[model samples]
Target chain A: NNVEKAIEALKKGEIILVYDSDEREGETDMVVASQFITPEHIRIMRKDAGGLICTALHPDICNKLGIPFMVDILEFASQKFKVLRELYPNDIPYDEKSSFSITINHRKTFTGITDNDRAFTIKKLAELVKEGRFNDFGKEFRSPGHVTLLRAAEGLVKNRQGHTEMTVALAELANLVPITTICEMMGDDGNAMSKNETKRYAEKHNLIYLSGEEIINYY
Target chain B: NNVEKAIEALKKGEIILVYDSDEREGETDMVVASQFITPEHIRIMRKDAGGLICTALHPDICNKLGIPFMVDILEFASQKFKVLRELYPNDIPYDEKSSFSITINHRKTFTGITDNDRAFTIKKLAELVKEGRFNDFGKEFRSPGHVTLLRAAEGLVKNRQGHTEMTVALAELANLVPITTICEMMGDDGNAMSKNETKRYAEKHNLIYLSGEEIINYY
Candidate 1:
């Protein structure tokens, strides 16, 4: 029931709260479809959620656009900087590999780091993916700019239940472009917002709250 | 003559162009006093210069704030991600070590990635460094956001002629807070703007253009 409600909210361009298991990062992310992202959504995430705002994209789109995982970039950069070889990110207690790919800013954006600029970039990126304009990526966006991008697992939630995969999976299930914007809800105590705290906030806002387990089970 | 005029421009919050040696990155940068940075200045750098806009700080300030060189950050991060250890940035053809330190956003910024937001962050950071409010850094800024920070070499232009060092040196010469904002001038040819191109643009704009050799010789 919650999954259905969450998908409905996503399709309608509303925010939903998704929490991975306590065994994982134990984080709750404020999720929205990238196609529907707006400056207001970015403001809410930065002001209220208080975490890194990132976009998750389907693996196919990443491949088509020639986006490489951040680890791969590091590996290549290691050829020059031996220090990079040592920072392999193998110690992530919550996941097998990082979903981070590249940070980008659309060419049309002024600073590409503001709420409006990031929302524009995310929405344009979603449209690009939906339109299958893989070749236009370079023309439309610049790397190392702003707006961090995450690559979903190739097998989606079946392979990993990280927010990267979970958000993309949720987008796919809703028949929206498989690009989702997510920001972790941070607490004042310097940790991720607790599950109870997140649920309470979700309830107060009348937004759907779903667990990673529920999405995985539904798939 | 050019250096003096450039310093005058800096004190007046006007933009000057600085070109590193032809033997090095061979690039020109748009430079301004960090304390004088405004949204319009950021807009000019991003829109016209079309390169990574970064802030350069005096080493003393960086040390006081406990900001580590990005390479050092990579080294520490390598403990978790083995790949980071290998990407040590040793292959830079023009420099010995990267001057990069960290990226940060003012706590008051919305997305901290826009021109206005970054201008605010850079200006506030300069004020903080100027006021010697070292203890308030954490209270005022958050890292890994937007606004990349670079640490000038301890010896300023004596130890390095990179833009990071040159800009800080310029600010010191101008008797301003030794924090400066810089952006590489990029060309349509997918390379840094050439010295001649930068000079012509500077002349057209009636701004002073100084070379790294002149800066080093002045010291």
Candidate 2:
């Protein structure tokens, strides 16, 4: 039922809170369609959550398109710029198994804020992926975007409970493409928001907050 | 003509440097098809230019989509977090007349670093714009991308000499959409690269480099 509600929320371009159980990062990400991003939502992220805004996409879609990880970009840059070599990470922070992803900007705006706009863009992105138009990825959507891409860990239905997994899972359950935006919650102090604080925020915002455990159990 | 060469270069997915004459910002930007971004190019930006990597798109395309500026997003975030309000820019640093733009990320790989890959993406992007697939702007493309949209000052053939103007003018001259990426050159010390330095770099790399003065006269 929560999964159904989550899908409904996405369809309306509303915000939902996703909880990565204690076994995971014990974090909660404010979730919405990448194309549905709005200025107000960005405000929520800056003041309320204070986390990096990232989009999550399907692994197969990435594979078909030949998307690589951020680490790879750093590696490539390092090859050309000795200065950039220092910026390369031996290990990426999230989704240890991440295959490929990119940060993107739509062709229309300075800052792609506005959930409805983002939703439309993201929806189209998902459609293109399903259609297997790999070439369209950059033509229609672009990279080094404010919106970063997250490669979900394998086994969409199991093991992973991170935002990448949750966002993709939510999309799958909703019969949508496995691509959407998510931002983890960090307090004003720049620390992860406590589970209780996240829950309270969700309640106050009238969001259909759910845990990854619940999703896995029912989905 | 330089304009013809610029377009020809674009068709081949090669880069063309545009100079924003001293009459304007007195700056020069490395210009290329927005969709034609490659990782090797990103390396060129990091190692050779050391400037901000940004994309530019048509203004009408942005209006159709309602993309907000980064400043607007900051303002919204400021409303929620008092501290964030302080971060809002009363004015953006670039052209005040800017209508639409975004930085983008591709779905795969580090910086669409190959010229062939970027050329393919950009070529299609220009085609879609020519076809006037406005709705597809968002549905087909989303934001916060490595490649951003750019809108030149009105009267595409005249009244402008900045990168925005030259890029749009070149596209118009070439019969392509006005979308491309640009990076201002900087020294190893992080300052703007002298005209000589940029020209030398372009020649060294075998790139098509043009100045605004040259473009204004020819196109």
Candidate 3:
């Protein structure tokens, strides 16, 4: 329920603030917990462990400071870019244009809608549009494909963990793009991994993978 | 629901093959113009799509595919890894780890739990678990946190694409550890990225991550 509420809140230009009701009485109220709350979130009770407190959204998002205070998650969310810069320190940030193959065309109409719950939805859609999934275009669509892809781009550029840093970044890109294509059913020939392709793709890629021949025949 | 079905199917050593039904089926039934058919998968049908597939049930699988069969998804999903391998055949392979990581972990238990639907639910649950939010942990009590975390490790290992080969491979180790440690709400005072954690623990104590604030607040 918290995750659901969290997504709902996030999509509505807000973030969920998970609080520990079990904390000292004084610290229980939003007024007291507000000290630890960030610019990108709101306060709520932790579902499982009610006494803990957290922004309770994805871990990658930052809280915005104050900007009219009308649920302006944009400021805090935007700061993630800056955080990425800090993490990478010396690494070069990815160029938005070259780092992506984002395209929106006649088949896909960009809806102006915005909802936090839709974040995952939007991010997923990007994978579809990239693969030319025009037939399944959404009606109230807010170009979810665009946002989903954008979020992923951020994940890629910010993914600098040293040694295999670039691998982490690229993996983020490859996984989302192809699988989202699967779900959207862009219908790419065997040339692509459709939404229903396979998650064990990596583990099953080699001759050793099919050792479990029994599974393959059932499908 | 596929997870339940998978549970039943796997119990009897039945082979399981989950895929989308829309990408221009190749001698397959239930396919609409080729691609596989799924529930929540958007972009497959020309209408507004929702709830047609599982989310993250792709990895952390505990089935016994030991029997024999014919098809070969057991080996893997798409051809990108080979594509990357071909491009960098002699070398370490451009972001080989990332390429694999990107390609792994696409399904989860809750992803395809709804009746008659399969892939999307499994797929979505896996995604949420990766970000560290157990929305309905008790949604099904027989479930274990091990599955989600395991998939997280598997994803890191398989999705590495163009760089950071070592990082992706190392992360797999962390995932193989005790389930308790892997399922930790947040390790080191809420400082953990299971995928990167494995790589970090293996590589050394370099802090290649975003600031603690960024890690907890924004991720």
Candidate 4:
């Protein structure tokens, strides 16, 4: 039932929280359709969540598109510049679930901060993925679009709890193309919501809150 | 004649080098019509020159659109996170000539790598700017579009040698809108080209070369 709740909410472009297991990463992330990200959502990530804003994609599509992770790209650059060697991320914040991510910067505009514009781009992107016209993407958008696309490592169920996993998993269960954006929530204290805090937030809002264990059981 | 040559090249969408005085910033950058940027140009910047690709916009347009410098944006973000506090740029790569800059990341793409594809987006961008539809920029493109928009600190002439200065000045001289893109050239040694090397490269390529002083004198 909670799985259905989460899927239905996502389909409506509403926000939901997915928390990694207490034994796993112990992090809560705000999940929504990449197309649904707005300036207000950005503001939430900026003010309340205070973490990186990244998108999760179907691993197949990501590989087909040949999008490299930022850290890997940095590693390639490290060959050219010694300074890059230091910048390459050895220990990223969410290493357990996320394979890698690249930052997205769509295009120039009046206020690059709005939900309407982001959704428009995301919707178009989703359609492209659905149509399987992977090549059309690079021409319309730049290398690193305004959203970071994150991938989950190889195994599915074993890796099902990372936000990246949850996003893709939810998309698969909902029969949608596995492309959704997520932002880890680092609260006012500059840390992830405590397990108790995430629970309260979910209960207060009537949102389906799922731990990785619950997700695996439901699937 | 050099000034005339420079103007002619820009009009034809060719590139020119603008060098700041040794007494000042001691930097040189490759200048092109922002509207003329193609995937090929991006290739030149990425492979040949190997430097940051940035854009220069008219001060009026930048202010009217409320686009802030990358530094200021970071400063504002610093208040939200101590991590940002450390990440804020203390010294930029090209400080002497550039007054302000925004890092550019358009959107995600499959072939965001090719020249033909990039030109398609840029040509369209140039047309929009050419038509005086600044307001529509946000709608058609995401903010900070594919290029980082930079602004001159003072008047175009006073800042003439900087890429930001020269772009506006060249636009005004050519009787066109002052919006252009530029790339700082880092050579085989992974360093910005020296003044002599830039001049030699320009001469070898039969491209126009100008200095900030020459621009000041001509204007």
Error of 4 at B177 (Å): 2.3
How much does candidate 2 score in TM-score? 0.47
Angstrom error at residue B213, model 2: 22
Write down the TM-score for model 4: 0.49
lDDT of each: 0.76, 0.58, 0.21, 0.59
Which candidate leads in lDDT? 1
Instruction: Supply candidate 1's per-residue lDDT for B65.
Output: 67
True contacts kept of each: 0.00, 0.00, 0.00, 0.00
TM-score of 3: 0.18
Arranged by TM-score, best first? 1, 4, 2, 3
User: Which regions of candidate 1 are displaced past 4 Å?
Assistant: A1-219
Interface RMSD, every prediction, one decimal place? 12.0, 19.2, 24.7, 21.1
Ranking under lDDT, best-scoring first?
Answer: 1, 4, 2, 3
What DockQ class does candidate 1 belong to? incorrect
Q: Please identify which of the two predictions, 2 or 3, would achieve the higher DockQ against the true structure.
A: 2
- Model 1 DockQ reads 0.05
Pick the TM-score winner.
1
Cα error, residue B166 of model 4, in Å, equals 1.9
State how far residue B215 of model 2 sits from its true place (Å): 29
User: How well does candidate 4 reproduce the true complex, by DockQ?
Assistant: 0.02
lDDT per residue (tens digit) for residues A1-219 in model 1: 879889989988999999897776777899999999888787677656755678998998877876767666555555554434444445443466667665666767653545667788899988888888877776677544457788898899888888899889989899999899998776654345688999899989899989988999998
Residues B17-84, model 4: lDDT tens digits:
88867875565678888776766565565444534456677777666555555445434443432232
